[PDB]
Amino acid sequence: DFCGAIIPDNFFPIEKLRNYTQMGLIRDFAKGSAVIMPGEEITSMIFLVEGKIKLDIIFEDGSEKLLYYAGGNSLIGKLYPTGNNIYATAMEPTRTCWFSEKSLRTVFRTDEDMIFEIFKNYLTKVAYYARQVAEMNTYNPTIRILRLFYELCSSQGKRVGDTYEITMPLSQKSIGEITGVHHVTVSRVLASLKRENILDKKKNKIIVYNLGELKHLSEQ
Amino acid sequence: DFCGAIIPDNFFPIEKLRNYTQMGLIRDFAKGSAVIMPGEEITSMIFLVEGKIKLDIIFEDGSEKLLYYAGGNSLIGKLYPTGNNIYATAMEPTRTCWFSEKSLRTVFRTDEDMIFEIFKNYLTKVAYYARQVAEMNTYNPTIRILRLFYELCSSQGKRVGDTYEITMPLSQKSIGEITGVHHVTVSRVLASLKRENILDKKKNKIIVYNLGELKHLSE
Ligand SMILES: O=C(O)Cc1ccc(O)c(Cl)c1
Ligand SMILES: O=C(O)Cc1ccc(O)c(Cl)c1
């Protein structure tokens, strides 16, 4: 039931939707193919059976921004028109199941519990983006990066001896896109955290050596 | 079925939940009272029967930001813990109806259409805040104000002679809360639009005198 997310990746997965694929439409996408083409009117929820999708918004002038990444058991909630132009691409071989409104009605008639899993996925999304707007309007770029590391550590960090490890590949490019901070700032902040023996951001994991100092710095 | 919103006010209203408030819990709030107290854990959808609520987020340092305004038939979607500290206050005398998960099961067993109205309400919120993040990362403060005015005109400007009128009280304060732009920028932009005979943002209405020019300046 917990609908917090720290990064916009794998928002509240619903693995149980796999039990209802007969009620929807299976569609596959090779790496690089468009799951949602720019300008395409989507009126389906799109369940990712396995794979990976990058989901962006496109503005009227052609500029493009990351919204989120989605993996196995993720759900794209675009049942109705929203007024946003969306471009979603497969990052690897991807199988999806598309559920129209009518299809979903058959799902919920079979399994009431599915309604609430979907609410939990929408809610996780609203809480994520609503907080992010507010944080962007409150905290400077360096503080947003520190808050991100601190939060990630408290949500996903597992203590291995005298330290915490967060097992995820979080690229500097991805940090930039998620925080809306320019690359020199990202590199400099990450480089000082490593230098001062607080946190080392590696390719495959983040190691936090001093969580109280990271917290303390994030609060300045 | 349209799940757009230009301003964080009266997100996708659900009038038909009025039909089911006997399945929920009616709670009344006086003007100035906390509908959602700071620190309060909420596990109900909260339907606004009548009145008005200002709903804010509060950070660990006690700093606070507007998320939205809600009026009659609005829905607060806080059925599960989110990890955000939320503070919601009644701006007028307010009647609400609180729907637990259990109460919602009863609603949906009765009328399956309510499922989908709630989906529309959530989808409208996601689309609003996700777009706002991306725009904040795309467009400078002044262009975000212009875009706000042009999109409001396009969606609900009413033609009156050579003008378009947007009938709403939208304060300079609220313009800054919505756009994330500081007051001195908001005042200078509004004063320049008025100077240049493009747009006059008055107290209870906004008049657009040159739409094509506003369109152009926003781009
Ligand atoms: O389509 C939109 O405007 C925003 C959006 C994108 C992806 C999602 O999964 C949702 Cl719920 C909304
Ligand atoms: O509770 C939150 O973290 C965000 C929030 C606030 C109000 C709402 O109606 C929703 Cl759906 C979410």
Residue numbers in the entry:
A (entry chain D): 9 to 228
B (entry chain C): 9 to 227
Please quote the paper that reports this structure:
The transcriptional regulator CprK from Desulfitobacterium spp. induces expression of halorespiratory genes upon binding of o-chlorophenol ligands and is reversibly inactivated by oxygen through disulphide bond formation. The CprK associated with the o-chlorophenolacetic acid (OCPA) reductive dehalogenase (CprAB) from D. dehalogenans and the closely related D. hafniense has been shown to bind OCPA with μM affinity leading to sequence-specific DNA-binding, and ultimately transcriptional activation of the associated cpr gene cluster. Members of this family are homodimeric and contain an N-terminal sensor domain linked via a long α-helix (involved in formation of the dimer interface) to the C-terminal helix–turn–helix (HTH) DNA-binding domain. We here present crystal structures of the oxidized ligand-free (3.2 Å) and reduced ligand-free (2.0 Å), OCPA-bound (1.8 Å) and DNA-bound (1.8 Å) D. hafniense CprK in addition to an intermediate OCPA-bound structure obtained by soaking ligand-free crystals (2.0 Å).
In order to avoid formation of the inactive, oxidized CprK under aerobic conditions, the CprKC200S mutant was used to obtain structural insights into the reduced CprK structure. Previous studies indicated that this mutation does not significantly affect CprK function and only has minor impact on DNA-binding affinity. The 1.8 Å crystal structure of the CprK:OCPAC200S complex contains two CprK dimers in the asymmetric unit, each dimer binding two OCPA ligands to the N-terminal sensor domains. Similar to the previously determined oxidized CprK:OCPA complex, the phenol and acetic acid groups of OCPA interact with amino acids from both CprK monomers through extended hydrogen bonding networks. This positions the chloride atom within a hydrophobic pocket at the dimer interface. In contrast to the marked asymmetry of the oxidized CprK:OCPA structure, near-perfect twofold symmetry relates the monomer structures within a single CprKC200S:OCPA dimer. This arrangement places both HTH domains in a position compatible with binding to the palindromic (de)halobox DNA. The CprKC200S:OCPA dimer structure reveals that each individual CprK DNA-binding domain establishes a small contact area [approximately 270 Å2 with a surface complementarity of 0.691] with both N-terminal domains of the dimer. A large proportion of this contact area is centred around an extensive salt-bridge network established between the DNA-binding domain Arg-155 and Glu-159 with the central α-helix Arg-139 and Glu-143 residues in addition to Glu-68 (in the sensor domain). In contrast, a significant set of hydrophobic interactions is established within each single monomer between residues Ile-14–Ile-15–Pro-16 from the N-terminus and the DNA-binding domain that leads to near-complete burial of both Ile side-chains.
